[PDB]
């Protein structure tokens, strides 16, 4: 039994392991929604507008998830300021603040998100009010300091209130620009949704079959108003590709206003009057593209804003697919 | 060709390697692994957002680091063991110091500047690292200062993966233009370019003296290419294997070529005689990755089935 000093390494491994087990219990419950497109000059922008108009967004609950990020930003800023105070040898305008500074390092164990008693707030307001701290801060151009330092410190009252809801500028500054996950985690019927807006079209399949598989749902955006036949052939090839045999295809027929005008003035024969025959014909041309599977369960919706018959439909489709896939692996069928 | 050259020598025969350890704790697909230079530690990457480094001798997890973004496709271990480099759909290579920096994380560098996904990376030393990206470029970065200091352009399609020469002075890359390009690290340019696959090239590795390499492709063939002769030397393809190849590695002598197939198996080929010498089974899904220790003592296999197996 060569357990000597080692039965501490073992102890560490089992402690990390309990943690690994706990993260796993939380995970796997996420509903992943993928926004795709961008294979053109502006497709994913149309997708974003479709999300804004028909899928709402920016609720209080999603804003609440940014509290810790705001706090973390605040903390690195205040630590940078404190250390620079120590570095330049600047003394307090009132020697009693030297006790506050000792308290500051002690009270900086209060980094318990959202514990914003009046005492902590007053400690931060008093440190920030000190003349040596202001003196160092206004010379920040001589060292490295986040530009948002003053922005946050002058608005600490609003941000630290427990009902704080981040604004659009707060979110935009949280470094979620470019690409850029494009994320929200709104709550509905006690389900936590995660929606991801990516692109890639006509040929980016190799990267997202390579990473997107086993995902809960695909949101497939189609420009309804869309050598034209080679493009149609390429679309046939991607949509109907054998590597996508076991993936449910959900269709958001988007830009319906433009599609309705275009089919009004530009005949459908370019690709292959009133809406019903042309729409039925498009459905027939698309559904004939499968040719290899018994069914796909496509959920087609005709939509107005988020205050109409749309949210029920999306949550109904997520629920029926999860149920049918739970029965698929219980011996039943 | 080597195949028509080695026909006379005796075959290797019964290659019976056994699983000596099963490492448990990942809860999703493994996308990458890399042997440490001690032939004992290894790193694995999973969609649970964790990169775990294991001590393979005792069956202990040394660290499990939770990653901020889970969409990883590549990772790398510095040969010093001092750093890892983890990529993502964020187009950023994050560097983590495993030995001198005490404890857990803070990130010292996020290598930003690629405009497509980071597809591959390999350290040179604790200084310099070579990386590939979906933006169709490759780049050498100075991690300390954070700038792309060298840039390797000339591929015309997404770059898939990369392999460092044994002296780390040269590297070769393989891309979805179905080509591989040899680049000079310090000169920052392509010496030679090899085309011929009709497929994306998914995999690449080196003969131990750095004078030849093997490719693995979705076109169901593997091929051996020689640098100095500047051409393909051999193709490896059963007629009834039409699926992709995911991974290649040499044994210590270079004699064994291990390859993972979409058909759920890892065939072990005699690299000198082109016969399959052995099989790595025990998985419920595609073998997606594999690797041989620098000392040759063991092989690790990683799989879409969420398991790794250790063989010797």
């Amino acid at each position, epitope marked *: 039994t*060569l357990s*000597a*000093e080692d039965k*501490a390494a073992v*102890e*560490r491994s089992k*402690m990390i392991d309990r943690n690994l087990r706990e993260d796993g219990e939380k995970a796997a419950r996420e509903v992943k929604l993928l926004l795709l497109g961008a294979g053109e000059s502006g497709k994913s922008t149309i997708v974003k507008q479709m999300k804004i108009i028909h899928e709402a967004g920016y609720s209080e609950e999603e804003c609440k998830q940014y509290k810790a990020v705001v706090y973390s930003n605040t903390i690195q800023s205040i630590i940078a300021i404190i250390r620079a105070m120590g570095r330049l040898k600047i003394d307090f305008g009132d020697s009693a603040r030297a006790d506050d500074a000792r308290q500051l390092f002690v009270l900086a*164990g209060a980094a318990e998100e959202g514990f914003m008693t009046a005492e902590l707030a007053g400690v931060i307001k008093r440190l920030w009010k000190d003349s040596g701290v202001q003196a160092c801060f206004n010379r920040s151009r001589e060292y490295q300091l986040n530009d948002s330092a003053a922005y946050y410190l002058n608005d600490l009252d609003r941000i630290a209130q427990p009902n704080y809801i981040p604004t659009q500028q707060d979110v935009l500054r949280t470094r979620v620009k470019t690409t850029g996950i494009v994320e929200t985690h709104f709550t509905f019927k006690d389900l936590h949704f995660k929606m991801f807006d990516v692109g890639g079209q006509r040929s980016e399949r190799k990267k997202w079959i390579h990473c997107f598989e086993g995902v809960t749902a695909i949101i497939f955006c189609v420009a309804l108003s869309d050598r034209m036949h080679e493009s149609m052939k390429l679309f046939d090839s991607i949509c109907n590709n054998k590597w996508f045999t076991d993936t449910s295809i959900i269709l958001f027929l988007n830009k319906k206003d433009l599609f309705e005008e275009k089919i009004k003035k530009s005949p459908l024969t370019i690709c292959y009057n009133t809406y019903e025959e042309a729409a039925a014909y498009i459905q027939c041309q698309f559904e004939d593209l499968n040719k290899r599977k018994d069914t796909k369960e496509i959920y087609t919706h005709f939509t107005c804003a988020t205050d109409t018959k749309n949210v029920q439909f999306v949550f109904d489709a997520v629920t029926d697919v999860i149920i049918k896939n739970n029965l698929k692996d219980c011996g039943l069928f | 060709t080597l195949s028509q050259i080695t026909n006379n020598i005796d075959p290797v025969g019964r290659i019976q390697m056994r699983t000596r350890r099963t490492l448990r704790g990942h809860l999703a697909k493994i996308y990458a692994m890399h042997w440490g230079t001690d032939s004992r530690l290894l790193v694995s990457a999973s969609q649970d957002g964790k990169l775990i480094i294991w001590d393979s001798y005792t069956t202990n997890k040394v660290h499990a680091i939770p990653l901020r973004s889970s969409w990883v496709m590549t990772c790398a271990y510095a040969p010093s063991g001092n750093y890892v480099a983890c990529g993502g759909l964020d187009n950023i290579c994050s560097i983590y110091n495993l030995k001198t920096r005490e*404890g857990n994380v803070r990130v010292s560098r996020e290598l930003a500047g690629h405009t497509g996904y980071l597809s591959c990376c390999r350290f040179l030393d604790d200084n310099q690292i070579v990386t590939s990206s979906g933006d169709t470029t490759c780049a050498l970065w100075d991690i300390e200062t954070g700038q792309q200091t060298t840039t390797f352009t000339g591929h015309t399609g997404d770059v898939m993966s990369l392999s460092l020469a044994p002296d780390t002075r040269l590297f070769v890359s393989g891309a979805c233009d179905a080509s591989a390009k040899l680049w000079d690290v310090r000169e920052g340019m392509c010496r030679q370019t090899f085309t011929g696959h009709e497929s994306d090239i998914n995999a690449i590795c080196f003969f131990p003296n750095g004078n030849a390499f093997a490719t693995g492709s979705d076109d169901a063939t593997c091929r051996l290419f020689d640098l100095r002769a500047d051409q393909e030397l051999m193709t490896y393809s059963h007629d009834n294997i039409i699926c992709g190849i995911t991974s290649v590695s040499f044994s210590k002598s270079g004699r064994l070529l291990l390859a993972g197939y979409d058909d759920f198996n890892c065939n072990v080929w005699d690299a000198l005689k082109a016969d399959r010498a052995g099989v790595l089974a025990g998985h419920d899904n595609r073998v997606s990755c594999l690797g041989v220790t620098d000392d040759g003592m063991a092989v690790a296999t990683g799989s879409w089935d969420s398991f790794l197996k250790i063989w010797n």
Partner: single-chain antibody
Amino acid sequence: DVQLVESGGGLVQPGGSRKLSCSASGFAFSSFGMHWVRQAPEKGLEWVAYISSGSGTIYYADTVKGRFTISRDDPKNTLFLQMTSLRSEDTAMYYCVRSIYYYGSSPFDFWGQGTTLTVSSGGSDIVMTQATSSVPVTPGESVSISCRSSKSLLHSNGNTYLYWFLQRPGQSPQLLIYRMSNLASGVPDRFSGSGSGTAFTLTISRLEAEDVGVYYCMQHLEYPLTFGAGTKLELK
């Protein structure tokens, strides 16, 4: 920046009780094992107690079991020591020591400043022997101190569990060699260690001014942890 600040020390009558504290900062406190080591007034270091990370493993010195309680408050990054039945033989300087254990780790790599406890008036362990209690040296010269154990410190796993520490006069001890051959961080390359099985040697080349102090070897093969009596290097 790693800090360990002990407090709670002082003079106590025999038979009394006392809680020591050790305050940790700048590291993942709950990830480290912790030890207590004490040093009698004119004597060497003697290991007192160990609590693993997570408190799953606890070891006591024989002279203290039943009387002493070791504890930790990991969420508050605080260490406690509950003392009872204090004897005169408990009078010592007490160091709290952090020790992380994993493949390649360096145990005993950070020491607090130490707190002094003074108490008023009223076998199976491997023995390590440094037969030479002091040695006069001159700067620039090279010295070799030796130590031996009554049992082999080389384990069946292949490692030889021998550590060298330096306590300069008036300061906390400083790690010199871990696991027989690993140089501690910050230690100059003029130090080197060698030996075999049961006899070991630490050699300094071109001995400098700062090199003066007491050198202890220590085994970490098994508990209780035990120190050598110490060898002092005096200037000529």
